[PDB]
Design an enzyme around this catalytic site. Structure first.
Site, short mmCIF file in Angstrom:
data_model
loop_
_atom_site.label_atom_id
_atom_site.label_comp_id
_atom_site.label_asym_id
_atom_site.label_seq_id
_atom_site.Cartn_x
_atom_site.Cartn_y
_atom_site.Cartn_z
N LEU A 43 -82.74 -44.28 -78.69
CA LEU A 43 -82.81 -43.26 -79.66
C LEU A 43 -81.47 -43.19 -80.12
O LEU A 43 -81.20 -42.87 -81.44
CB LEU A 43 -83.31 -42.11 -79.21
N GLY A 44 -80.34 -43.61 -79.44
CA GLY A 44 -79.15 -43.49 -80.00
C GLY A 44 -78.08 -43.63 -78.61
O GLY A 44 -78.54 -43.96 -77.72
N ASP A 154 -69.48 -27.84 -77.12
CA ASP A 154 -69.79 -28.71 -78.32
C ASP A 154 -70.76 -28.39 -79.07
O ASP A 154 -71.79 -29.19 -79.24
CB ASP A 154 -69.90 -29.93 -77.51
C1 LIG Z 1 -77.86 -39.52 -79.38
C2 LIG Z 1 -79.24 -38.75 -79.08
C3 LIG Z 1 -80.41 -39.42 -79.07
C4 LIG Z 1 -81.55 -38.74 -79.07
C5 LIG Z 1 -81.75 -37.48 -78.87
C6 LIG Z 1 -82.70 -36.69 -78.70
C7 LIG Z 1 -83.70 -36.79 -79.69
S1 LIG Z 1 -85.16 -35.95 -79.25
C8 LIG Z 1 -84.49 -35.48 -77.92
N1 LIG Z 1 -85.08 -34.75 -76.90
C9 LIG Z 1 -84.61 -34.18 -75.85
N2 LIG Z 1 -83.24 -34.88 -75.87
C10 LIG Z 1 -82.65 -35.60 -76.57
S2 LIG Z 1 -81.04 -36.00 -76.03
C11 LIG Z 1 -80.90 -35.76 -74.13
C12 LIG Z 1 -80.56 -34.14 -73.80
C13 LIG Z 1 -79.16 -34.02 -73.52
O1 LIG Z 1 -78.19 -35.07 -73.68
O2 LIG Z 1 -78.77 -33.07 -73.27
C14 LIG Z 1 -83.41 -35.84 -77.64
C15 LIG Z 1 -80.38 -36.72 -78.95
C16 LIG Z 1 -79.04 -37.28 -78.83
#
Ligand SMILES: Cc1ccc(-c2csc3ncnc(SCCC(=O)O)c23)cc1
Ligand SMILES: [Cl-]
Length: 329
Positions: A43-44, A154
Site C-alpha cells: 500500500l505504501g 505527527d
Molecule cells: C503509508 C500508508 C499506507 C497504507 C495505509 C493504510 C491505508 S488503509 C489503512 N488502514 C489501516 N492502517 C493503515 S496503515 C497502518 C496503521 C499505522 O501505521 O498506524 C492503512 C496508511 C499509510
C-alpha cells in the site's frame, strides 16, 4: 535559559502509573502467529516501514501489515507499547497482532483495515457537517491519548484514515508518539513541516500535548478554507514566516519574549513585520459553505503561538462549532 513549561492538563498521568506503563524498553512482546497472515499488495512505504494490505487466513478478514525496517529496537518497542496502551480508545487504530519471522526475527505490526479514501480526493467533497463530524472524531482520539499520557506528535491528514461511507475515522502512525513527563526536553524534530507548531520551529523543547492541537488547527484551516496545506513553508524557517504572515509578528515576538526563547538571528531578517490577518480574509466563494463564525472562532483558539493558550482536546469538544455533532452522538 528559556522559561520552564508544564502541560495544563494530564500533567502527571505517567508519574502515577506503575513503571511498566511508560517504560517501553522493559515491555515483553507477546507474539502472534506470522502464518496467520498473507500479504496481498503493497500500500505504501514510510521512511522506516512498508505497509501492505493482507488477509488473516484464519477468518478471511482484511488487515494492514506494517513491516518495520531495521531500526533501533527502542523505537519499535515504544510504538508497540503506545499502541497497546491506547488500544480500544475512541478512533485510535487497533493493533490486532504483532508477528515476526521466526527465523529472521523481522517484526511486523498487524492493524485493523480501514477502507480509506485518500484525503486529497476526500477533502474536496466533504460538507460543512462532515468536517465538524470528523474533527470531533479526531478530538476524541486526541483527548483519549492525551489523557493516557501520550502525545501523538505527527497529526496530519495522511495519518487520519477515513472510511467515509461508514463515517469511520482512525488516527494512525504512532511511530513518533511519546510519553509526556513534566519538565522533559523533547526532540523538536517531530511532525511534518506544515503541521509543526511554533514551539518546534523556535526550538522550545519543553512542549506537551498542546503540540497536537496546533497540528489539528492546521488541518482544520486546510479543510474549511480548501487550501492544503494551509501553512506552506519551503523549510522550517520559512514555515514560521508563513505562520507569521497570518498570525502576525507581534504575537510571535510576545511568545518568544514570554518564554525567553533565544531566537536565531537569521529569523529577524526574514520574519519582517506582519499584522494579524482576520480569518475572514481567507473566505471566498469556493469555500464559504464550509466557514461559519463558529468555525473561525474555533480555529482562532487552536492556532495560537503560546502552546499554553490553545484549547485542550476536551475544551475543543465543548465548542459550539460541534453543537449539531454532539446531539447526533
Ligand atoms: C503509508 C500508508 C499506507 C497504507 C495505509 C493504510 C491505508 S488503509 C489503512 N488502514 C489501516 N492502517 C493503515 S496503515 C497502518 C496503521 C499505522 O501505521 O498506524 C492503512 C496508511 C499509510
Ligand atoms: Cl488535550
Amino acid at each position: 535559559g528559556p522559561v520552564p513549561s508544564r502541560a495544563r492538563v494530564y500533567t502527571d498521568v505517567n508519574t502515577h502509573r506503575p513503571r511498566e506503563y511508560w517504560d517501553y524498553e522493559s515491555h515483553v512482546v507477546e507474539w502472534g502467529n506470522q502464518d496467520d497472515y498473507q500479504l496481498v499488495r503493497k500500500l505504501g512505504r514510510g521512511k522506516y516501514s512498508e505497509v501492505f494490505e493482507a488477509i488473516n487466513i484464519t477468518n478471511n478478514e482484511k488487515v494492514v501489515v506494517k513491516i518495520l525496517k531495521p531500526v533501533k529496537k527502542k523505537k519499535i518497542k515504544r510504538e508497540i507499547k503506545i499502541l497497546e496502551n491506547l488500544r480500544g480508545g475512541p478512533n485510535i487504530i487497533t493493533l490486532a497482532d504483532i508477528v515476526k519471522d521466526p527465523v529472521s526475527r523481522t517484526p511486523a505490526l498487524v492493524f485493523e483495515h480501514v477502507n480509506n479514501t485518500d484525503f486529497k480526493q476526500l477533502y474536496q467533497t466533504l460538507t460543512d457537517y462532515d468536517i465538524r463530524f470528523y474533527m470531533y472524531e479526531i478530538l476524541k482520539a486526541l483527548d483519549y491519548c492525551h489523557s493516557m499520557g501520550i502525545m501523538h506528535r505527527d497529526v496530519k491528514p495522511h495519518n487520519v484514515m477515513i472510511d467515509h461511507e461508514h463515517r469511520k475515522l482512525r488516527l494512525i502512525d504512532w511511530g513518533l508518539a511519546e510519553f509526556y513527563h513534566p519538565g522533559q526536553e523533547y526532540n523538536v524534530r517531530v511532525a511534518s513541516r506544515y503541521f509543526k507548531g511554533p514551539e518546534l520551529l523556535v526550538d522550545y523543547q519543553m512542549y506537551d500535548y498542546s503540540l497536537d492541537m496546533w497540528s489539528l488547527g492546521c488541518m482544520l484551516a486546510s479543510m474549511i478554507f480548501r487550501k492544503e496545506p494551509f501553512f506552506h513553508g519551503h523549510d522550517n524557517y520559512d514555515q514560521l514566516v508563513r505562520i507569521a504572515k497570518v498570525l502576525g509578528t507581534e504575537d510571535l515576538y510576545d511568545y518568544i519574549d514570554k518564554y525567553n526563547i533565544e531566537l536565531d538571528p537569521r529569523f529577524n531578517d526574514i520574519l519582517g513585520r506582519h499584522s494579524r490577518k482576520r480569518w475572514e480574509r481567507f473566505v471566498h466563494s469556493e469555500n464559504q459553505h464550509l466557514v461559519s463564525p463558529e468555525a473561525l472562532d474555533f480555529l482562532d483558539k487552536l492556532l495560537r503561538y503560546d502552546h499554553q493558550s490553545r484549547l485542550t482536546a476536551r475544551e475543543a469538544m465543548e465548542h459550539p462549532y460541534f453543537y449539531t455533532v454532539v446531539k447526533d452522538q
